[PDB]
């Protein structure tokens, strides 16, 4: 009896600034071939039918815990959500061909209005898919194999892959959040469906691309990693490693006027992904050792400066990131012995980082041997 999705969808406009949010979608007027205007109106009417339909059904999201575990979330199948989705289909489909035309030239205003509205629709879609697993599975099923709105959203992803203007960069970060929600919702068999997103992803994580997009992209890559076939699909085997670009972004961060918090969380997400990867010749393997040395150094420096418990969530964050990074590194040493050779480049700073890290580690109560032993491997 949650209806969290319904409250999210119909409420104050989710988008800061522009007030275009599902609510308006439903009330959106016609003035403001295949994508007929009447079909637009009908997509609105469909999301409204779903509004009036969701509450009606009664359901248990997960029949058993294992099944709900696989998805990582229980969803009660609300027919309303599936009806909602056609509205997103129309608004996302809009302005895609218009963007294509804008680019082919060498008409924009329509593309812009439609794109703002479409980011609204993307957030709305996140919510709607999040609540009902049926609306998701519908998009998810394929011949070999994507939903039609899924193909239009792939177009949108191509726009993400493409060089991102300011507004397009924010839109792209939105798309990446959509994608992480997409993944988590997707079923294991639907991960092969997600395989197509990989080709878009390398452009998605780029020095030009904004930070929040990269945080969400690391999350999406992590979601993809669980699939056995997807996991190898990461580095290009000497062809530029794809992971290689993410860790490079973290090592040196384009878009330097950005929230430090989100930087930190992106890095922590890559840490989590590295762990999950561990559970499941390259230039990149040498390259990865550099970003992590830099990050552990940042954290250690922060600790040295700081005194007493971490009031700031940021400081507690480092304490935790430092321990996790030390753990990943201990492996960045047990994993490869050649690892240390390519690490020597940053080893000057890393060696200094290490000892005070050992100190703080031994200090923290959350710290453990499995955590301090990791550190002992790096510094000796």
């Amino acid at each position: 009896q949650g209806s969290i999705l319904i409250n999210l969808l119909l409420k104050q406009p989710l988008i800061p600034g522009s007030s275009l949010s599902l609510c308006h979608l439903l009330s959106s007027s016609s003035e403001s071939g295949s994508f007929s205007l009447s079909a637009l109106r009908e997509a609105q009417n469909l999301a409204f039918t779903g509004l009036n339909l969701v509450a009606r059904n009664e359901c248990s999201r997960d029949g058993d815990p294992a099944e709900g575990g696989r998805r990582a979330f229980p969803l009660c199948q609300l027919p309303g959500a599936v009806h909602f989705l056609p509205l997103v289909q129309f608004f996302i489909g809009l302005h895609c061909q218009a963007l294509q035309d804008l680019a082919a030239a060498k008409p924009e205003d329509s593309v812009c209005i439609l794109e703002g509205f479409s980011v609204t629709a993307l957030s709305i879609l996140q919510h709607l898919v999040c609540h009902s697993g049926a609306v998701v599975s519908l998009l998810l099923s394929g011949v070999g194999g994507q939903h039609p709105l899924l193909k239009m959203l792939l177009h949108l992803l191509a726009f993400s892959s493409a060089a991102t203007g300011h507004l397009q960069a924010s839109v792209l970060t939105q798309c990446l959040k959509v994608l992480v929600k997409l993944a988590e919702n997707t079923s294991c068999d639907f991960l092969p469906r997600f395989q197509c997103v990989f080709q878009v992803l390398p452009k998605c994580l780029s020095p030009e691309t904004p930070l929040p997009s990269v945080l969400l992209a690391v999350e999406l890559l992590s979601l993809l990693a669980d699939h056995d076939q997807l996991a190898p699909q990461l580095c290009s085997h000497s062809e530029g490693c794809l992971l290689l670009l993410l860790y490079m972004y973290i090592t040196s961060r384009p878009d330097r006027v950005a929230l430090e918090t989100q930087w930190l969380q992106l890095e922590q997400e890559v840490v989590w992904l590295l762990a999950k990867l561990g559970v499941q010749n390259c230039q990149c393997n040498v390259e990865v050792v550099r970003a992590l040395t830099v990050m552990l150094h940042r954290q250690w420096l922060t600790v040295r400066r700081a005194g007493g418990p971490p009031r700031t969530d940021q400081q507690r964050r480092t304490v935790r990131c430092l321990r996790d990074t030390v753990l990943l590194l201990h492996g960045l040493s047990q994993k490869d012995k050649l690892f240390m050779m390519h690490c020597v480049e940053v080893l000057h700073q890393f060696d200094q980082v290490m000892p005070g890290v050992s100190m703080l580690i031994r200090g923290l109560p959350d710290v453990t041997d499995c955590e301090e032993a990791a550190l002992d491997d790096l510094c000796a």
């Binding site: 949650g2 969290i4 058993d64 294992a66 990582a72 997400e269 989590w272 321990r323 753990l327 700073q349």
Partner: protein, 718 residues
């Protein structure tokens, strides 16, 4: 392999938690339950856990959650927390007092470990709010079992710090402020035996008030609705509880916020009370406390009613100082109504039993601190301050009675007769707080008594009165005869068994240069309203003390002091050397130049540091000293920076990699401070840096005094 093992463990724990949840549905029972996972050939080359009573399950699940937490570092992955959080939401669904607490802690931990996904938070949030509501029905033995963990989980979910409102879903924040105001209308808050629970409710209320982006949690009008429900509950609970302190805060915060809104309302003179209707109800509560005090006489328990009146008056005074009003002005509680409350307080002091008034004196001392905050916002002219200073010394007056100060003090006559009865009940620490306010008492009122009382508290052997006196003694001396020279009695008194008295004297020195300046108006808070709930102190004090001091160049005086200060800067305590690290940069700012006498002192310090370092052979001291030498170099734009950089190069040119790394970090720091390209800052000091490197190379030639290793070393230096 490790991960496959952990995954089997996860699946087993999930089977057990699912067995619990199926017990909840009652459809089937697996007892005795043996998990499919972890069956091994070793058992029969099996014996999976067998449980037969639901409590056996509960224990198995507790153990398994402990294991999950312990591995959490390695186990947590991106979206691994999703499944764990579903499991934890189930664990919360039905919660045994202790497993419930540990699961609270666990979901909080995961929340921190990977943030909080929006969707999973709804699942757990539902059961969570249900638990909150059940609190009042719950017996203390059961609810308290997990409450503390509840409080920590709330802290994490509703951290006062930035973006904690982003973590929570806005609807969830509205629901929680709505759930809180409901308990408040219910009175459940006061009902629950544990104060920290209602305290966590107030925590959330404040978090909404000040930190959260206005309206993000809920609509502004309905948020004010919830605030008013909270005020309603508080007004009653305060009169009920013997001590309203555990509620004073939330109240004070609401008062300040209401004043903020009022000010904007006024402009596109109304009392901060008459302007806010909810604050008007708060004023009604305060007036009721005062009336009950006066009307009851002996009937009302002096301690409880006095505590309530003191809480009300403290809120009023806090607002007085913090809230600022000729178009607009803000009225405040009349000091004559204060005098009425004070007549009541004297009658009570007389009425309380000797042992009974010790609590009353404590509450009266708190009310007096509030009155002192009022005096700081606006120093009462003469007589209120007089009577106050008198009362604060009453515990000492009956003993002082036969003193020269008693003979001189104007109010001392009546104070002698009045002090005997109230003082034996006067708590020593209470009278200590009184002297803290008595020291605050200005000179204009009870001048003779105030001077003699600072002198006495210094004379008294007890530490509390002496510390109180020490606090305001610098100001006293300033006002007494001389802002420049401290008094000899205090000088002897400066030395204290408590390090904190010494740190207070550090702050006092830092304040003494201002003391030479016209004594600034003093307010206990002085800024930064207190929340409801020592060589390093020496560096802190000095940073502020030097700026006012004329020490930029001064003289031998500086030379000698700074000599002692350099000894200290190199102090055995690693933390002492640290956090004075950069205190030396603040001193470079404090110094008018980095050359000459200052440069000579720096060179002497560097020599002493080289000797100590050879002796120390301790990495921590070296880290502190490296950072300090660095900060020094960075702060300076002249010769010292290249001199410090050459010392740092000598440090870098050492077999130990750590020395070189520390010096390199300091070099990067100086380059940054310099704000020039690597090659450019090289260019500025290229001649001296390379000359020092060539002197090091000549020392390396003396060391040689094989070419192979020599050349390898030279290339590595390059």
């Amino acid at each position: 392999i490790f991960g496959v093992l952990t995954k089997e463990l996860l699946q087993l724990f999930e089977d057990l938690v699912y067995l619990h949840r199926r017990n909840v549905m009652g459809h089937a029972v697996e007892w005795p339950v043996v998990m499919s996972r972890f069956l091994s050939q070793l058992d029969e080359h099996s014996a999976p856990l067998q449980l037969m009573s639901m409590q056996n399950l509960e224990f198995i699940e507790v153990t398994l959650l402990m294991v999950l937490t312990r591995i959490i570092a390695i186990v947590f992955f991106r979206r691994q927390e999703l499944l764990l959080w579903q499991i934890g939401c189930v664990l919360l669904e039905y919660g045994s007092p202790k497993i419930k607490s540990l699961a609270i802690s666990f979901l909080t931990e995961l929340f921190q470990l990977g943030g909080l996904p929006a969707q999973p938070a709804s699942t757990f949030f539902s059961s969570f709010l249900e638990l909150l509501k059940h609190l009042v029905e719950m017996d203390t033995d059961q609810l308290k079992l997990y409450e503390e963990p509840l409080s920590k989980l709330i802290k994490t979910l509703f951290p006062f710090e930035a973006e904690a409102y982003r973590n929570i879903e806005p609807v969830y924040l509205n629901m929680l402020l709505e759930k809180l105001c409901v308990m408040f209308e219910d009175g459940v808050l006061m009902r629950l035996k544990s104060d920290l629970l209602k305290a966590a409710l107030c925590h959330l209320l404040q978090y909404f008030l000040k930190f959260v982006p206005a309206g993000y949690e809920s609509a502004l009008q309905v948020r004010k609705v919830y605030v008013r429900n909270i005020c309603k509950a508080l007004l009653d609970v305060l009169g009920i509880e013997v001590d309203a302190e555990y509620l004073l805060g939330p109240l004070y915060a609401a008062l300040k916020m209401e004043s903020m809104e009022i000010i904007e309302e006024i402009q596109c003179h109304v009392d901060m009370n008459q302007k806010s209707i909810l604050w008007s109800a708060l004023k009604q509560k305060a007036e009721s406390l005062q009336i009950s005090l006066e009307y009851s006489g002996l009937k009302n328990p002096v301690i409880e009613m006095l505590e309530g009146i003191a809480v009300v008056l403290q809120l009023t005074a806090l607002c007085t100082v913090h809230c600022s009003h000729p178009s607009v002005v803000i009225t405040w509680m009349s000091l004559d109504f204060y005098t009425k409350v004070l007549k009541s307080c004297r009658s009570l002091l007389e009425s309380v039993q000797k042992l009974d008034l010790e609590a009353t004196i404590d509450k009266v001392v708190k009310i007096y601190d509030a009155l002192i905050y009022m005096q700081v916002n606006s120093s009462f002219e003469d007589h209120i301050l007089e009577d106050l200073c008198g009362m604060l010394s009453l515990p000492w007056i009956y003993s002082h009675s036969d003193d020269g100060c008693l003979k001189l003090t104007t109010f001392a006559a009546n104070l002698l007769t009045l002090s005997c009865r109230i003082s034996d009940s006067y708590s020593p620490q209470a009278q200590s707080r009184c002297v803290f306010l008595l020291t605050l008492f200005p000179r204009r009122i009870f001048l003779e008594w105030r001077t003699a009382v600072y002198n006495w508290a210094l004379q008294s052997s007890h530490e509390v009165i002496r510390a109180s006196c020490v606090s305001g003694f610098f100001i006293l001396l300033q006002q007494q005869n001389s802002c420049n020279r401290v008094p000899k009695i205090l000088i002897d008194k400066v030395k204290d068994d408590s390090d904190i008295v010494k740190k207070e004297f550090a702050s006092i020195l830092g304040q003494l240069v201002c003391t030479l300046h016209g004594m600034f108006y003093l307010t206990s808070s002085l800024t930064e309203p207190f929340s409801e709930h020592v060589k390093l102190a020496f560096i802190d004090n000095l940073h502020h003390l030097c700026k006012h001091l004329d020490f930029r160049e001064d003289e031998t005086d500086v030379k000698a002091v700074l000599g002692t200060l350099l000894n200290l800067m190199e102090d055995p305590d690693k933390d002492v050397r640290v956090a004075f690290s950069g205190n030396i940069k603040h001193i470079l700012e404090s110094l008018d130049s980095e050359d000459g006498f200052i440069k000579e002192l720096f060179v002497l310090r560097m020599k002493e540091a080289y000797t100590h370092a050879q002796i120390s052979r301790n990495n921590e001291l070296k880290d502190t000293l490296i950072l300090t030498t660095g900060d020094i170099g960075r702060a300076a734009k002249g010769d010292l920076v290249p001199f410090a950089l050459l010392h740092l190069l000598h440090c870098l040119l050492s077999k130990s990699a750590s020395v070189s790394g520390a010096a390199y970090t300091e070099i990067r720091a100086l380059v940054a401070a310099k704000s020039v390209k690597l090659q450019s800052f090289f260019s500025q000091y290229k001649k001296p840096i390379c000359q020092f490197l060539v002197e090091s190379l000549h020392s390396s030639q003396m060391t040689a005094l094989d070419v192979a290793h020599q050349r390898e070393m030279a290339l590595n230096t390059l």
